[PDB]
């Protein structure tokens, strides 16, 4: 499906912070909470891809883009962050803040 790919692309391209998630997903909730703790709400979009008729197509495309089909899948300014654990590594090692600083999202 070109349609599914274009829809996913629009989510990633029209939101600086794009998170693909599913219902009742503890590591989705943790990742989203970390990002909101940086006061990123205004530039964040969370898409629940389980509440979607094309979940499998979306997951397969997310795997083409990132190497994994699992949620959460996290993009920052179209760059692949990855999953919650990737976000935690970046956060703890200062890479996340650096990322956000270059975008003007944190001082
Ligand atoms: Hg679920
Ligand atoms: Hg949005
Ligand atoms: Hg994590």
UniProtKB/TrEMBL annotation:
Positions contributing to Zn(2+) 2 binding: 45, 47
GO molecular function: antioxidant activity; glutathione disulfide oxidoreductase activity; metal ion binding; protein-disulfide reductase (glutathione) activity
Disulfide bonds: 25-28
Highest taxon listed in the record's lineage: Eukaryota
PROSITE patterns referenced in this protein's UniProt entry, alphabetically: GLUTAREDOXIN_1, GLUTAREDOXIN_2
Protein's organism: Plasmodium falciparum (isolate 3D7)
Binding site for Mn(2+) 2: 39
Residue positions binding Zn(2+) 3: 50
Protein name: Glutaredoxin-1
Modified residues (Cysteine sulfenic acid (-SOH)): 25, 28
CDD domains to which the protein is assigned, alphabetical: GRX_GRXh_1_2_like (cd03419)
Glutaredoxin domain location: 17-81
């Amino acid at each position: 499906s070109e349609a599914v790919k274009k829809w996913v692309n629009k989510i990633i391209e029209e939101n600086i912070i794009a998170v693909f998630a599913k219902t009742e997903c503890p590591y989705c909730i943790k990742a989203i909470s970390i990002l909101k703790g940086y006061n990123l709400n205004s530039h964040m979009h969370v898409e629940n891809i389980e509440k979607n008729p094309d979940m499998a197509n979306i997951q397969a495309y997310l795997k083409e883009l990132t190497g994994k089909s699992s949620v959460p899948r996290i993009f920052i300014n179209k760059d692949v962050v990855g999953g919650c654990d990737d976000l935690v590594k970046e956060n703890d090692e200062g890479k996340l803040k650096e990322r956000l600083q270059k975008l003007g999202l944190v001082n």
